Amino acid sequence: AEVTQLSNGIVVATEHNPSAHTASVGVVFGSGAANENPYNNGVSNLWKNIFLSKENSAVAAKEGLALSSNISRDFQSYIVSSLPGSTDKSLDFLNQSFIQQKANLLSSSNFEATKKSVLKQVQDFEENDHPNRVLEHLHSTAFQNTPLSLPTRGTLESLENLVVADLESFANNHFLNSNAVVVGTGNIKHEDLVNSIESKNLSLQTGTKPVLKKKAAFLGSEVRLRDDTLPKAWISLAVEGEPVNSPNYFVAKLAAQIFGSYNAFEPASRLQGIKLLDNIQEYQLCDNFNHFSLSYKDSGLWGFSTATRNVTMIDDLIHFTLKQWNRLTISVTDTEVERAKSLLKLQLGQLYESGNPVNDANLLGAEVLIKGSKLSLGEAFKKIDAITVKDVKAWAGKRLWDQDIAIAGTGQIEGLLDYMRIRSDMSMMRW
Amino acid sequence: GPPSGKTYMGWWGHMGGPKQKGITSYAVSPYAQKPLQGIFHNAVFNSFRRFKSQFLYVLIPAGIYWYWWKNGNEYNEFLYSKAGREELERVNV
């Protein structure tokens, strides 16, 4: 990975790979869904679908080019893919839709066709995708009245008030030269990308992103969306975790790998070395679970999600899981730390070394915006190998022992008890 | 064991009400709230609102039974004094 700032202030990052048969060039901006207010929530989701509209995709398809876009809470990306030897054609396409000509995409015929397509997607998401809308409600109750609680797709009530003047106002404040990184992955080398950008002189004005007033803060709270006509119950639960650039960034990732993932219908996932599986397989308390560790610029979340049809034993599934989190402070063993070291190196080795240059362009550009450089995979492996049992017990006594939680749930969640009997399971009464 | 007769209450998960759909609820942890912020306005304004709504159902029956006892107590004191001696002989026959 090579990073280089040019004479006019453009940051170029490149990860060359000579054994790939494609190349990807794009632009990543450092503003996401957490840079909006509750009135224009959804302008980033509308800018993505304007880029991927049919009249834009038909111009790129005549040259042999494919388009991609991704909206997150801290960044956005607009990526063009081609063959290794058509990389200057994908730079001319990216020039003519972000720099030199943007008023033909925001015509009134193209805007109203795009807006009714996005309104159909958000309506279909809210009635059909139950594990993913419970995790979005967990962000809105844990970080409430703070910028980190807005959903990345927007809401159905906020999207119907957006006009074409809202999209031009968001682009003038956030699509700036001091907020952008030009990325390149696959079969493309660093010097041909720099010389191709420098051939077009690119005036590129000197604005600056608006700064936010409110800092993100965690609050212990809950939200319940009861629906008795659904066949299951979907629950997420979390504490406050680590941000990016934390010293305990990898220790929180190793603690979630100790408890891991589960699928009750796969025979090999029932044989894993996890002590929680002894409690929940006797009466078949759930269908699946997974533990996460999400990290953002300001704060983070650490917890688990689950789905079950055993709706009369929900209180045993929450009680057995939280009693295993207590063991990280008092009685975590040595075999559990050595097993989670090997499975964490396999997990993020498959994340950073897939064969997709579109996935690598998103991970590379999001890291240079925050740190200014990218940590290597060989240096991340030495940090994981130096974690001891005392490092885990010191982290869990600060973040997990007797702390506030955030809960979200939907479906047949009558058997889920109050806040205060789940909150009292965060300590043991033994010690 | 065998099952028994039907009831109107169940247990957690099958309590026995109607089906619920469309209601959402929100709460906040007790550790995140300021302690005892109802020691002043609830004790003066709200308890006065609960008192005067229900005080005529209690004090109109209480005044009837206290007026009745007070006249019967004062008439018995007259009958056993010196001035009430010829009325005592005729209400005892």
Q: Report yes or no: B19 at the A interface, CB cutoff 8 Å.
A: yes
Q: Report yes or no: B34 at the A interface, CB cutoff 8 Å.
A: no
Counting every residue, how long is chain A? Answer: 431
Amino acid identity at A398 = K
The residues on A that touch B, with CB distances below 8 Å, are 141, 219-229, 311-315, 404, 412, 414-415, 417, 419-420, 423
Of A221, A222, A228, the CB nearest to B20: A228
Residues of A in contact with B11 (CB under 8 A): 312
In chain A, which residue's Cα lies nearest the Cα of B26? A223
List the determination method: cryo-EM
Q: At a CB cut-off of 8 Å and minimum separation 6, what does A318 contact? A: A235, A237, A416, A417, A422, A425
Beta partners for residue A307, in sequence order: A234, A288
CB contact under 8 A, A227 and B21: yes
Pairing of strands A221-227, A406-411: parallel
Which of B14, B23, B29 best probes binding to A when mutated, by most A CB atoms within 10 angstroms? B29
A·B CB contacts under 8 A: 56
A347-354 long-range contacts, Cβ below 8 Å, gap at least 24? A347/A257, A348/A377, A348/A380, A349/A377, A352/A377, A353/A377
CB contact under 8 A, B28 and A221: yes
In chain B, which residue's Cα lies nearest the Cα of A309? B13
Q: At a CB cut-off of 8 Å and minimum separation 6, what does A304 contact? A: A236, A237, A238, A259, A289, A290, A291, A292, A321
Coil, strand or helix at A81: strand
Q: How many domains in chain B?
A: 1
Coil, strand or helix at B75: helix
Token representation of residue A423: 């909150």
Q: What share of chain A is helix, strand, coil (3-state, %, to 5)?
A: 45, 20, 40
- Å between B12 CA and nearest CA of chain A: 5
In chain B, which residue's Cα lies nearest the Cα of A218? B32
d(CA A142, CA A372): 29
In chain A, which residue's Cα lies nearest the Cα of B18? A228
User: Of A411, A184, A426, A170, which is closest to residue A314 (Cα–Cα)?
Assistant: A411
CA angle (B55, B58, B64) in 5-degree steps: 125
Distances (CA, A) of A317 to A66, A230, A309: 46, 20, 12
CB contact under 8 A, A412 and B13: yes
Cβ pair A1, A184 in contact under 8 A: no
Distances (CA, A) of A190 to A25, A90, A183, A207, B72: 12, 16, 10, 27, 112
Q: What CATH number does the domain containing B31 carry?
A: 1.20.5.210
Provide the resolution (angstroms): 2.5
Coil, strand or helix at A37: coil
d(CA A325, CA B31): 21
d(CA A30, CA A199): 25
CA angle (A424, A430, A431) in 5-degree steps: 100
Cβ pair A400, A300 in contact under 8 A: no
CA atoms A370, A371, A373, A377: torsion sign: negative
Amino acid identity at B68 = W
d(CA A4, CA A6): 6
CA atoms A237, A239, A243, A247: torsion sign: negative
d(CA A100, CA A116): 27
d(CA A361, CA A379): 20
Token representation of residue A43: 């302008």
CATH for A208-431 is 3.30.830.10
Cβ pair A249, A242 in contact under 8 A: yes
The range of the structural domain enclosing residue B80 comes to 1-93
Distances (CA, A) of A325 to A320, A397, A427, B80: 9, 11, 9, 84
In chain A, which residue's Cα lies nearest the Cα of B14? A312
User: Of A329, A251, A324, A252, which is closest to residue A285 (Cα–Cα)?
Assistant: A324
Of A219, A226, A315, the CB nearest to B32: A219
d(CA A359, CA A273): 31
User: Of A368, A369, A365, which is closest to residue A26 (Cα–Cα)?
Assistant: A365
The string of DSSP letters for A343-379 reads HHHHHHHHHSS-S-HHHHHHHHHHHHHHHSS---HHH
Which of B26, B33, B34 best probes binding to A when mutated, by most A CB atoms within 10 angstroms? B26
CA angle (B72, B73, B78) in 5-degree steps: 95
CATH topology of domain A1-202: Cytochrome Bc1 Complex; Chain A, domain 1 (3.30.830)
Same fold, A1-202 and A208-431: yes
CA atoms A386, A390, A392, A397: torsion sign: negative
Coil, strand or helix at B38: coil
Pairing of strands A180-186, A11-16: parallel
Beta partners for residue A408, in sequence order: A223, A236
The number of angstroms, rounded, from the C-alpha of A36 to the middle of its chain's C-alpha atoms is 17
User: Of A187, A193, A177, which is closest to residue A4 (Cα–Cα)?
Assistant: A193
Domain residue spans of chain A: 1-202, 208-431
d(CA A131, CA B11): 26
- In the block, tokens 């008890």 appear at A417
d(CA B48, CA A230): 46
- Å between B35 CA and nearest CA of chain A: 16
Question: Cα-flanking dihedrals φ and ψ of residue A294, to 5°?
Answer: -95, 135
d(CA A396, CA A412): 32
E strand or H helix at B77: helix B56-79
